[PDB]
Ligand binder design. Structure first.
Ligand SMILES: O=P(O)(O)O[C@@H]1[C@H](O)[C@H](O)[C@@H](OP(=O)(O)O)[C@H](OP(=O)(O)O)[C@H]1O
Lengths: 726, 213, 296, 75
């Protein structure tokens, strides 16, 4: 037995109305629940890391509360309040460092910080619990507030105020402000099966504190049970991976083409180390003599050894680690301090206790069928080789938290996509989707959220890890589904401007902003997103910010521009401009023609064929000379099939007088010359011949000489003369 | 309006001040501590009251002016005077307790001397001038006979030299405010300059700054 | 529930109390509405404090609007979705003979009335805040339904008058949309129904009050506002103006019109007349002569 | 003639459209000069106007080999 101290990692087990461990539903949700069927004290739940909390001292939020109030409802006052809040945060951190290791006594204030989410538990007296109206609400808050304060009180008459709290003692957690003890109610959440709400209300429930890890053991210089680690084979310089090959999970060594093998990091390579202890709920720092198990984070399976089909034993993944087979033992590869704790980032040799065989890497690929196999089989052999050693590389907790957040966000967006596909989505669900999309924007952009508008975010340097997580965790696929499903009954592009569709409009702009942010300086993500170029084009012309994403994707990317552009893209562009007869679309064609101020031969030829084809000539204004010496005349055909013909001088006069039709026609003509000139850049003879046939040297000279014509029109004609003829 | 509990402090503070009048070391020590089974220090409680009224760290961070208002300015001055009475005599233990208290009341006193209460000063300059005078008197009493520089070091930590040099200059240039004022701003500036010399004896930067052109 | 009535009576026509009501009282009432449940007594207490001695308290309005919108789906309950609208219609069909006391329908009506009252000060903050909660589309959908009682119709018309029409800032939806015109058509239908009912030696006091209190004021506010003289979109619709003119003048022609509420009616005519000459719309010979009889 | 007109007027860069037209004109002059159309005497009679223009009172960037480079026998 021992006395609970500040900074210890413990798990709370209610045994009142319902018996179970308090935990959370995820990182994107702020609900705390108890699952009786998940496990018991003797058999802890499989996902035990979700039930662990840290005890922290009382913190001051007065200045922070004042700053929040000021934000809710001059500039110098706000700056002073922000400085006061920052000073309060620093003082709280210093005090927490000071009181670290102190013994907890009944009647004191203790805050429970969830380890997985890094959010303090909080009781709100101003809100009612969702399932039970009488009880107050309990939620997780990252920043924290006065509601997080909790009194630990004796549930047993033997314990008295001022006594030292002893591990394994049932206690009562009373919110300081609310004053109503927490309670594991019997109400069951609709969305989650078997999970019961936790709410603040008078009850008889008691929480049995179990010490998962002591404060002294909580040091980052040692290998601690529950840590997420990566196994790296030094000899082959490969990371151990577990993934489904055909229909079953297999363990192998992935092959990487990157310059640095260590730089290659993937989610499937993450393993969790669990130290075997007499107490099922006890972790603690590991020792060389102590046994260990490795659990796959993504799938939850446990590594073990099985009969080899043909290398007597082969490494595999089994659903349950309770079996004795999963047990493993570690052997040092260098001198150690009298068999002290295993150091962090230390090379070790793994052995199977049941078989007494040591691990070994085999060259026999697991995916020989694939053109470029990347999976190498591993096997356990009785003989030990000093070369065959797997190093354990510690992963920062921040990376694990980001991965969990990405997975939870992907799941929630998949649920939202399913709801939209069904055709009906609740307003509250839509608001939750909007909030999660804003959080994703701020998460990918890697910029602190200080009230700045989410839509307009500028990032000095992209975070490669965040973008890789976005691609790997399928978040981009869920975003594409979010964009596709609503438009194809639920909402129409033309109806987006309507006030009724304003929230959907905001959702779509947020999605496009996410896509734009995710693909900055990333070839793989750029290709993955550009695979939906047709869908992006389908949404062009509406206030959905698709133009920004389209421009960014193809901006200063010659390889991407060449690969992802074909005749179909130009066909869509020309169809759209024909539908709208808008010069901006010709401007888009011209931008497509040239990238980085250098002509792209392939897309240039494609646009050459598409624009100058006999079909689509209706959108293309025609220029002629009339003796009336000779005056230049422009003939244009509207989408209604009506043909109009007017002299260039007459068109300029009409534009000067303010005629909207003639001015729009002249702007379209100017963009037509821009497109033609870009078509003829870098000595493109194919279009040069056609344009010279359409416009001659004398005609261009006459147009550019006449001062009555618009100055910009003369500039465009001079540009065309410089490119095509000179 | 002030609550009854806060209101009752003023007579208590005045009574404690009267007890320690005439530099009675015996009563000052008795108030600070007593030969009792359970000892209750009154000077620390007075410093805590001043800190809470002034906002403690929040007030010392430049927000002192907002908390102080005309309604409780009298109580603030009363507690400052009570602290001065505790310190004067001089009393080594009372001054050490006030300077080195956990609440950091000395930070509030330094902010009071250095940071003018904008709201009160805008419509009532005389109250702010009197409050600054009282704070300067308290600080002077704290180092009446403190040969050790630890108290001066604490004050300097809570108070940079340049701000005292500037404040002394302003107080000299603030004499125009003496009109319809009982306390001369220049007199308060002179007292602050004497305190600045006392600090300069320990601080080189303040000594250099205090030297005229 | 018994203390709410006493609290309301304490502040009842007491401006010096209502204008000085402290925030904790309003917060406690709002929390009771949220946590304890949805009861009409709290809404009545909130409403009675906004207006005291005729004068409107801007403060209490601002805090009530700020706190009410914070809690949603428990305090400010609205029926805007198709399923919610169907449930509202199902509940209303049982109230054809009259809204039952303490029923959810009366709670909804009281909530709408309180929201409309909170915006009866030409405010710029509360109006925009409540515009989003109840869009004009839902208002027109619930008002134009054939099976609609007079209470909810009056509440919605008062809301769309004080929250939408009578505002300090321009609203795009009201003028640049074909929404208020359906409301005007429904108003003309209501006037015709009033005429028919009175011709049958029968009358509904609630319907008469609705037709003589809110609809006329709503029309006057719509047609006598700085943003209406522009008539950017009013030019397209001209027949509805003539229909309203003829309906209102015919209603005036009836002798049963009590004097107290005649003025506004007449005023409406004048306003419409001021529009007609501006809009150059066609006028019937008989109607034109009848209007000109009193134009000068 | 256009370069002469631009140099003749004071504060030539005032009317944005005229700045665009002047950009086009100078681009044409540059291209012709590097093609060798202008004669050396014509080149001087032109550089007088260009110096006057910069005298104290649809955009694509293309850069060839640094022109401000000393000519060399072997490149
Ligand atoms: O150098 P580039 O052009 O950026 O390409 C990167 C790298 O060269 C590999 O293609 C790939 O590593 P693997 O073969 O190990 O996947 C990596 O994917 P990653 O982003 O998934 O690490 C790419 O980003």
């Amino acid at each position: 037995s021992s006395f609970l101290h500040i900074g210890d990692i413990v798990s709370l087990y209610a045994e009142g109305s319902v018996n179970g461990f308090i935990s959370t539903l995820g990182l994107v949700d702020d609900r705390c629940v108890v699952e009786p069927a998940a496990g018991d004290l003797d058999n802890p739940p499989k996902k035990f890391r979700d039930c662990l909390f840290k005890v922290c001292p009382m913190n001051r939020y007065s200045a922070q509360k004042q700053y929040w109030k000021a934000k809710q409802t001059d500039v110098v006052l706000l700056q002073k309040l922000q400085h006061a809040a920052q000073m309060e945060q620093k003082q709280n951190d210093t005090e927490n460092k000071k009181v670290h290791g102190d013994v907890v006594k009944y009647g004191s204030v203790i805050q429970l910080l969830h380890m997985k989410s890094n959010k303090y538990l909080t009781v709100n007296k101003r809100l009612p619990a969702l399932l039970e109206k009488n009880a107050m609400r309990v939620t997780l808050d990252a920043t924290g507030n006065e509601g997080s304060w909790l009194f630990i009180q004796p549930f047993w008459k033997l314990r008295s105020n001022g006594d030292n709290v002893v591990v394994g003692d049932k206690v009562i957690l009373n919110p300081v402000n609310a004053g109503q003890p927490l309670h594991a109610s019997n109400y069951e959440l609709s969305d989650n099966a078997g999970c019961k709400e936790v709410n603040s209300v008078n009850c008889n429930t008691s929480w049995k504190i179990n010490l998962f890890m002591q404060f002294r053991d909580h040091l980052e210089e040692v290998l601690k049970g529950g840590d997420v680690v990566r196994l790296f084979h030094a000899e082959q310089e490969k990371f151990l991976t577990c993934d489904e090959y055909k229909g079953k999970l297999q363990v192998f060594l992935r092959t990487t083409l990157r310059q640095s093998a260590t730089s290659a990091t993937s989610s499937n390579a993450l393993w969790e180390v669990e130290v075997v202890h007499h107490d099922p709920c006890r972790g603690g720092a590991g020792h060389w003599n102590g046994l260990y198990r490795f659990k796959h984070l993504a799938t939850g399976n446990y590594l073990a050894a099985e009969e080899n089909p043909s290398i007597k034993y082969c490494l595999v993944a089994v659903p349950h680690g309770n079996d004795i087979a999963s047990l493993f033992e570690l052997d040092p590869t260098t001198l150690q301090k009298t068999d002290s704790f295993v150091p962090r980032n230390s090379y070790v040799r793994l052995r199977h206790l049941c078989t007494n065989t040591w691990i070994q890497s085999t060259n026999v690929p697991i995916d020989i069928e694939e053109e470029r196999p990347i999976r190498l089989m591993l096997g356990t052999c009785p003989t030990k080789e000093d070369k065959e050693a797997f190093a354990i590389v510690s992963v920062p907790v921040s990376e694990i938290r980001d991965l969990d957040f990405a997975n939870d966000a992907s799941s929630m967006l998949a649920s939202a996509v399913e709801k939209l596909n069904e055709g009906f989505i609740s307003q509250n669900d839509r608001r939750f989707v909007i909030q999660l999309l804003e959080d994703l924007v701020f998460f990918v952009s890697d910029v602190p959220n200080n009230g700045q508008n989410v839509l307009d975010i500028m990032v000095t340097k992209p975070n490669r890890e965040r973008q890789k997580l976005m691609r790997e965790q399928n978040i981009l696929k869920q975003v594409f589904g979010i964009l596709k499903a609503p438009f194809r009954p639920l909402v129409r592009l033309e109806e987006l401007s309507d006030q009724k569709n304003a929230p959907y409009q905001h959702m779509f702009r947020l999605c496009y902003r996410v896509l734009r942010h995710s693909q900055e300086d990333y070839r793989k993500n750029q290709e993955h997103i550009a695979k939906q170029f047709g869908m992006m084009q389908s949404q062009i012309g509406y206030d959905i910010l698709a133009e920004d994403t389209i421009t960014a994707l193809l901006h200063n990317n010659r390889k991407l521009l060449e690969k992802h552009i074909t005749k179909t893209e130009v066909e869509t562009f020309v169809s759209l401009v024909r539908k709208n007869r808008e010069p901006r679309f010709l401007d888009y064609l011209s931008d497509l023609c040239v990238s980085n101020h250098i002509a792209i031969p392939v897309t240039q030829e494609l646009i050459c064929k598409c624009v100058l084809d006999p079909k689509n000539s209706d959108i293309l204004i025609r220029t002629e000379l009339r003796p009336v010496e000779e005056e230049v005349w422009l003939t244009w055909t509207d989408k209604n099939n009506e043909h109009h013909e007017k002299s260039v001088r007459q068109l300029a006069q009409e534009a000067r007088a303010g005629n909207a039709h003639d001015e729009n026609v002249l702007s379209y003509y100017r963009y037509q010359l821009k497109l033609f000139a870009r078509m003829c850049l870098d000595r493109q003879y194919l279009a040069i011949d056609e344009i010279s046939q359409q416009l001659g040297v004398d005609l261009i000279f006459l147009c550019m000489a006449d001062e009555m014509l618009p100055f910009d029109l003369r500039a465009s004609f001079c540009h065309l003369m410089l490119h095509v003829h000179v | 309006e002030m609550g009854t509990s806060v209101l009752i402090m003023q007579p208590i503070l005045r009574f404690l001040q009267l007890l320690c009048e005439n530099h009675n070391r015996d009563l000052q020590n008795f108030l600070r501590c007593q030969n009792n089974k359970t000892n209750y220090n009154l000077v620390c409680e007075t410093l805590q009251f001043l800190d809470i009224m002034c906002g403690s760290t929040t007030g010392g961070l430049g927000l002192l002016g907002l908390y102080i208002n005309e309604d409780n300015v009298g109580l603030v001055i009363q507690t400052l005077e009570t602290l001065t009475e505790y310190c004067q005599g001089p009393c080594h233990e009372n001054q050490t307790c006030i300077v080195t208290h956990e609440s950091n009341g000395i930070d509030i006193i330094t902010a009071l001397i250095l940071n003018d209460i904008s709201p009160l000063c805008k419509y009532r300059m005389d109250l702010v001038l009197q409050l600054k005078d009282n704070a300067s008197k308290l600080l002077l009493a704290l180092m009446e006979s403190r040969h050790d520089s630890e108290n001066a070091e604490r004050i300097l930590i809570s108070l940079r030299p340049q701000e005292l040099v500037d404040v002394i200059k302003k107080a000299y240039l603030q004499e125009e405010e003496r009109e319809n004022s009982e306390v001369s701003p220049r007199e308060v500036g002179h007292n602050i300059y004497i305190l600045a010399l006392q600090l300069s004896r320990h601080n080189k930067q303040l000594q250099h700054l205090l030297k005229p052109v | 529930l018994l203390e709410a009535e006493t609290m309301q009576h304490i502040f009842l026509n007491n401006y010096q109390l209502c204008s000085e009501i402290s925030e904790p009282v309003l917060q406690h009432f709002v929390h009771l509405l949220a946590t304890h449940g949805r009861h009409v007594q709290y809404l009545d207490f909130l409403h009675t404090v906004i207006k005291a001695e005729g004068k409107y308290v801007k403060k209490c309005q601002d805090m009530i609007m700020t706190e009410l919108t914070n809690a949603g789906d428990d305090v400010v309950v609205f029926y805007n979705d198709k399923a919610s609208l169907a449930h509202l219609l199902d509940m209303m069909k049982a109230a054809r003979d009259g809204v039952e006391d303490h029923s959810p329908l009366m709670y909804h009506i009281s909530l709408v009335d309180l929201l409309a009252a909170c915006a009866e000060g030409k405010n710029v903050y509360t109006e925009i805040k409540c515009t989003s909660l109840l869009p004009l589309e839902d208002v027109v959908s619930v008002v134009t339904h054939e099976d609609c009682i007079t209470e909810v119709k009056m509440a919605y018309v008062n809301f769309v008058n004080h929250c939408y029409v009578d505002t300090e800032v321009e609203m795009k939806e009201i003028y640049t949309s074909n929404h208020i015109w359906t409301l005007f058509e429904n108003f003309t239908l209501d006037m015709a129904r009033v005429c028919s009912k009175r011709e049958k030696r029968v009358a509904d006091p609630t319907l008469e009050k609705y037709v003589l209190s809110v609809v006329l004021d709503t029309i006057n506010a719509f047609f006598s506002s700085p943003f209406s003289e522009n008539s950017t979109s009013l030019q397209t619709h001209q027949t509805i103006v003539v229909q309203l003119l003829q309906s209102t003048t015919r209603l005036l022609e009836c002798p049963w019109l009590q004097q107290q509420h005649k003025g506004s009616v007449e005023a409406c005519i004048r306003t419409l007349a001021m529009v007609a000459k501006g809009r150059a719309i066609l006028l019937p010979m008989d109607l034109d002569a009848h209007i000109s009889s009193m134009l000068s | 003639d256009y370069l002469n007109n631009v140099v003749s007027e004071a504060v030539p860069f005032a009317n944005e459209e005229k700045n665009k037209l002047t950009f086009e004109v100078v681009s044409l002059a540059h291209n012709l000069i590097y093609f060798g159309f202008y004669s050396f005497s014509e080149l001087l009679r032109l550089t007088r106007t260009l110096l006057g223009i910069i005298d104290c009172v649809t955009m694509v960037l293309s850069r060839k080999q640094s022109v401000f480079s000393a000519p060399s026998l072997s490149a």
